[PDB]
Design a protein around this ligand. Sequence first.
Ligand code: CA
Ligand code: NA
Lengths: 64, 281
Amino acid sequence: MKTEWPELVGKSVEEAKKVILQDKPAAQIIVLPVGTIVTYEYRIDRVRLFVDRLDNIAQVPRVG
Amino acid sequence: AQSVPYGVSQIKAPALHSQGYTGSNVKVAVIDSGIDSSHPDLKVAGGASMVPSETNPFQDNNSHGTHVAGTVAALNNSIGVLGVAPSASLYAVKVLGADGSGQYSWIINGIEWAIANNMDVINMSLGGPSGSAALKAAVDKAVASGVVVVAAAGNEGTSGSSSTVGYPGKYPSVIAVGAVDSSNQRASFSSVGPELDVMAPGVSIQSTLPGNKYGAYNGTSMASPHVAGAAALILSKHPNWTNTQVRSSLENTTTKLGDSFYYGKGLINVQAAAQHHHHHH
Ligand SMILES: [Ca+2]
Ligand code: NA
């Protein structure tokens, strides 16, 4: 089971969503700004995508 | 009838309750997404919101702050669950919006509010992968001012020999808390590193949710409020103990588990922490 996507860092948020939904079609994807503080609960269904101000992925996406 | 979630029993909070200590008159700020003050198993004493577009700290549009609050302080009655410190004075310090995120300046503003309002304990079930000088200054200021500051370690799992503890947990002044299950095994998602201080239950933790609900959540976010609640129990039994002393009491009386890189000092034991003389069990 794929749970991290380091190959998506530096890609557009759009391509990252498409790729993650191919691997995990029921993922609950939420896009947040990189450099924010976030809740530390663990959600096996969730993938947060942290984007820079250009809307590119700025941190390795992972399940949780 | 009320149920006692396993994690409350696992840290030995019922021993303090039977001695008559429940966190009365201890002020605990839950710095988080808000707390649903209408929940019949919570009593919220006060609070403030630092989120520009969500000005009511007593409306929790995410659910996370309400769950964390119930592990700290769900009321002792005939309903719902029981908190670690069910008599604590609970403050909703809203610094995260509905989506579970906040700007560093919102978190800092909430920490400053807590210091200005004489909070005895802060719980931060939250973090980010990088620090900032201003964030470090805010937590160091709260500690210098006498506040016990507790934070979730993060859910980044392992990464070889690298620390994966988040900030502000990773700062020396903050107690960083990892997650174990009911068998004392580290949760696979629990962050690791030399900054991990103690562990508490963080798997399938039942607590309060908005709109008079209950449910089981997972995370170091769930482990942190066991330790913040334990700090409130300790202060209710020893009201003159400093934050320094409360922190050492928890660290010095854990049940040691595995290697400290993965487990820190082990599982907290609030019964042993609240005695005068401290040793590990
Ligand atoms: Ca109750
Ligand atoms: Na720390």
